[model samples]
Target: LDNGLLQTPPMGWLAWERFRCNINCDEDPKNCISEQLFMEMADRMAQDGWRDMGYTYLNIDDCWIGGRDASGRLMPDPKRFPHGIPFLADYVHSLGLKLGIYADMGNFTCMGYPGTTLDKVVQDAQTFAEWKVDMLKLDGCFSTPEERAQGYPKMAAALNATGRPIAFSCSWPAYEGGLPPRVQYSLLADICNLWRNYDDIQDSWWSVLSILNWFVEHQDILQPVAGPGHWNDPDMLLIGNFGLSLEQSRAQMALWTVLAAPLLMSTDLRTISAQNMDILQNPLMIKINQDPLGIQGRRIHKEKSLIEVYMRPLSNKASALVFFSCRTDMPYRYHSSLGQLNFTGSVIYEAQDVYSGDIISGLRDETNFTVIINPSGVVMWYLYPIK
Candidate 1:
C-alpha cells in the first residue's frame, strides 16, 4: 500500500515542457523563470479548477539555481526570484498547491547552473526542506557513472534524513541508460518516489510514441517497479501546446494514464483552448490514472499496423481499456471484442466510454466494440463486470 510519501502517481504542472530554461528576464520577462511567472502560474490555478483536479504541484525545473551562497549552499537566482523560494512556496501552499524545485547530483546542472553535488548533499537537502519545499527532483547531469551510482542513493538518504516528508524524483536512468545493466529498480524503488526511464519528450507525437514504445518494451521490468509512492516517469504532458493536436493530446493523456506516469502538465494554461482543458481535467481519465490499485497498464494486444490495445486493472473490480491506432494514413475502424481484452471475472461487463461519457449495455462475449480511431488517436473505456 505504500512506497513513500506519494501514494499515487503525482499530478502537477512542471515548467520543463513549455517554459524550458528561459532565464532571459529582461528581454522575455513573461517566459523567464522569475517569481512573477511562477506566481502568475499559482494565481491562475487558484482562479482556475486545475488545483481541484489533483494537479497541485507547481514545479520549477532547471535554471532556477544560479550559484551557491557564501556558505556553500545552493542559492535561487536573486535576479529571477527576488522574493526568495520560501515566499513562493508559501504562495503556492496558500492556494492548496505544493512547490517542487529541481537540482542535479553533479557540480552543475544540465544548464551549467549550481547542482547539489555529493559534497553538498546534506545541506542542499536541508536547505530545500527548510525552504518549505514539498518535492525534490535530483537530476544526474554533469556527473560520471560512478558518481551517479554513489551520489543518487546518498542524496535520497539525505532527503529522508532531513526529517521532512518530501516526494523524491531521480534522473539516474538518464545517466546510465534507462535500462537494466545500469538501472536497478529495486534500489530505485527503495530510495526515490519516481525515476525517468527514457529520453526527454519533445513537443511532438513522435516523441510521445517513442516514450510509449520504451515503456511497452520494458514493461516487464518497469511495471513491477511502479506502485503507490514509486512510479516510472515518461516525462510531462504536452497537451495544451502547438506540437500536438487535440487527438494526439487525448492519446497522450490516455496512454500516460495507462502507464501510471505522473500526470504533470507543462503547458501555458492561460492560452489553452476549452478542448485542452476538457482533456486535461477529465474526471474519468483522472480516476483511471489515480486509481488505487497502481497497476501500470501494458500493450494487451498489438494488431498488425493499425491498432494497439492496452489494459489497466482497476481497484473497483473493473479495468480501464484503450484501443489505440498507429495508422498514419487516416481514421480507421478497428474491429475487436471485450472478451479478448484480458478482463478477468465475469464475461459480461458494462462499458463506459471515457471521452463521450456514454454507457453501453452489458458487453457479452459476442459483442463487438468497433471503434473508428483517428490516426494516432485512442478510444478509451472503463468496463465493470455485470452482476
Candidate 2:
C-alpha cells in the first residue's frame, strides 16, 4: 500500500484543539507539551478500554518541536521531551498505542516552530520515521497553493520511501479554502490517507454546528471522494472537554458517527467526567463509525432553520438517522413517516435509541412517527428493516 494505512477513518486522539501552544514546560509541567502528557494519554487509553474500542492513536499536534539538530534534522524540545520522540514512540508502542506527530509545509510551523518545507521534506519525513511515528499531520500553516501542490506529494513520496507505513494526514484542503476546484481532493485521496476538509473544531456546540453544516452543504462533491481507505475529516471530537453540555456532547458524537468522521478524541482523559467519557466510549456509536459500509451520511432536510435530519445507509440494509435541533428554547415535534425517514416501499423498521439504548415495539408498519427533539439536542436511532 503506497498510500499508507488508515483503512477506516482514523480514530484516535489529537492534541491541537484543547491543548494548543502550551509548550512552556517551566510554567506548567503537567499540561505542557512533553513525553509525559502523551504517555499518560496512552496509558489511560490502554487502561480505559479505549484502545480495545479502536481509539489507539495518540497524536501530538504542535509545539512539540525544537530547532533542527546540528546536522539539520528535526529534534524534540529537550526541556519537555527529555527522552526524545523515539523514546516517546517506544513508550506508546509498549502500551499498544500508535504515536502521531505533527509538521508544517512552510518555513515555520503554525505556532512558529520549525517547518517541513520542500528543502527539508526528506529530512523531516525521515526524522518522523526514525522516531517511530505511526502517523503524520502535515499542516499548510504558512504555505501557498502553488507551494502545497508542489510540495505535498513529494512529502508523501518521501515518507513512503522511508519504508515506514505512517498514516499521512494533511491540512491542505483547509488551506485552499476547503472548496473544490482549488482544492484538488481527487489528487489528495491518491496521495494521503485522510485530509481535513474544514476548519479546526473548537470545544463548543457552535463550532460543532458550524462544521456539520459545512459537511452537509458540501457532501454532493465530497461523498464520492471518501471510501474504505480515505475519509473526509471534520477534525476531532470535542465531547469529553469543557464548553459543551451533555446534550450538545451527544449531538457531536451522534452526528460524527453518522458522518463516519474520524472519532479522534481531543480532551483531557484524566479530568473528563464519567458521563462525558461514556459518550466518548459508547460501543454502539463506535460500531456505526467503524462500519464496513464506509458510506458518509448526508443531511436529508432542514426546516425553518431550526431543525435538520441526517442519515447514513448501513450494511445489511439498515440505516442510522439523526434528528438534530438548531433551536434554543423548546422541544420540536418533528412529524414524519417511515418512508420520509429514508425507508423503502411498504416495509417496517425497528428503532434503537443510540443515546439511551431504548428499544420499543408496536411502531411497526406505521409510516407516521413523531419525535420530540430537545433544544439543541439530537435523537439518533439505528433502524433495522423488520421483514
Candidate 3:
C-alpha cells in the first residue's frame, strides 16, 4: 500500500459526477443530496463493507456550502445539510470513513458560484482541518486566469502549512493537458495527493476512450511523476453511472486500475446494482491499482482499430497485461506475445484472467493467452513467470 511517498489510492465516492453542483438548487435535475441521503450513503458504505473494500472518504462536491457566515466561515446549506458540516464529518468518521470537501482555486466555481479565493485559502484549509476533512478537491473554476500557473502550488502550500495530513487534490484540467510532464509536475504543490489528468468523464465509450487516449498519449510523461503519495488521475470511475453499458463500465474500471489511477467512485453506491457492485469490488483489478510496485502502466503496443496493449510490471516479478479492443464486436488478436514483450524465455506463465478469475497455465508464449473482447469492452490479464 505504501507507494513510496504517495498515499495508497484513496478510494471513495464523490457526489458531483452523479449530482453535479445542485445539492439543493432548483435546476433541471434539481436533485440535491440531503442529510438523509448522506446518512443513508454512510450506512450503505458501512454495511457493504466499502471501507473494508478499501473504499473510504465520503466527499461532498461543490454547492454543499450555500454561503459564508457573517464571519466569513463557510456554512453548510441548512436545507441540504441539516446537521451541519462538523456534525456530518463526525458522523462519517463514526462510520470509520474519512471525509472530503470541494472548493475552487478561482474566485468562483465552474457553476458561477462563489468560492474561497484570495486570502481565504489558508482560512478555509484551516477550517476544513478543524472539521477533520481528510481530502480537499481544489478546483480551478473562475479564479484569475493568469494565476492558473501558480494555483496548484499555492493551494498545496496553504494545505501543507496547515500542519494537517489532508489530501490535496489539484483540479486544474485546462493547462496540464491531461498529464503534466515531470518538469511542470515538479512545480506543482507538494501536498497534491493527485491531480486531474483529463476533463470530466461521462458514461460513454467516447468519454472513456478520450480519457484513455490521454493516458496513452502521456503515459511516459506522467509515469515518472507517479509514486507512493501522488498519482495521475484519469478522473472518476463510471461503473454505475448513466449512459454506459455493463461492459463499458468494466472496461473503465479495468483501464483505470491498470493505469494506477486514483479509484474515486462517482456513482450512487447506495443504489448500485449487484452486478455493478461486483465490478466495483473486483479484488484482482483493485490490486493492480493498489499494487506495492507503485508503478503506473505504459502503452506497449497500439494497433489501429484493433488492439491496444498496456503493461505494468508488478513488484513480485509479474506483469499486468491489459488488452483493449476498439472493435467491440471483434475479439481483436493481440500481436505482442510474452516473447515480444521480453518475457518469452520461460516455459510457462501462471496467468489469471482478471475479469473471470480463471487461472491458466500458459506454455511457450503470449499467443496462448488471447482475449475476445466485446465491442468497446476490455480484457485485463495478469502474467507471472512459472517457477
lDDT of each: 0.87, 0.85, 0.75
Compared with the true structure, model 2 gives a TM-score of: 0.96
Q: Candidate 1's error at 52, in angstroms?
A: 0.6
Candidate 3: where are CA atoms >4 Å away?
A: 1-6, 24-31, 173-183, 332-336
Model 1 lDDT per residue over 1-387, tens place: 132577889999999889988989899999888899899988877778998988989999999986787999878888899988999999999999999999889888888888777899889999999998999888888889988888888888877788878888888887777888878888888888899888999999999999898889888888877888889999999999989987899999999999898999998887878999999999999999999888888888998866999988899688888889888889898877776665553567788989999898778866777777999899998888877
What is the lDDT, from 0 to 100, of the residue 254 in candidate 1? Answer: 95
Task: TM-score winner between 1 and 3, please give it.
Answer: 1
**Which number leads on TM-score?**
1
For each candidate, how many residue pairs have backbone atoms clashing (under 3 Å)?
0, 0, 13
Best by lDDT: 1
User: Each model's TM-score, in the order given?
Assistant: 0.97, 0.96, 0.91
| Candidate closer to the true structure by lDDT (higher is better), 2 or 3 | 2
Clashing pairs in 1: none
User: How does residue 92 of candidate 2 score in lDDT?
Assistant: 90
* Predicted structure 3: clash tally: 13
lDDT of 3 by residue, 189-249 (tens): 2546788866888767788888888777777677777777778788888888787888788
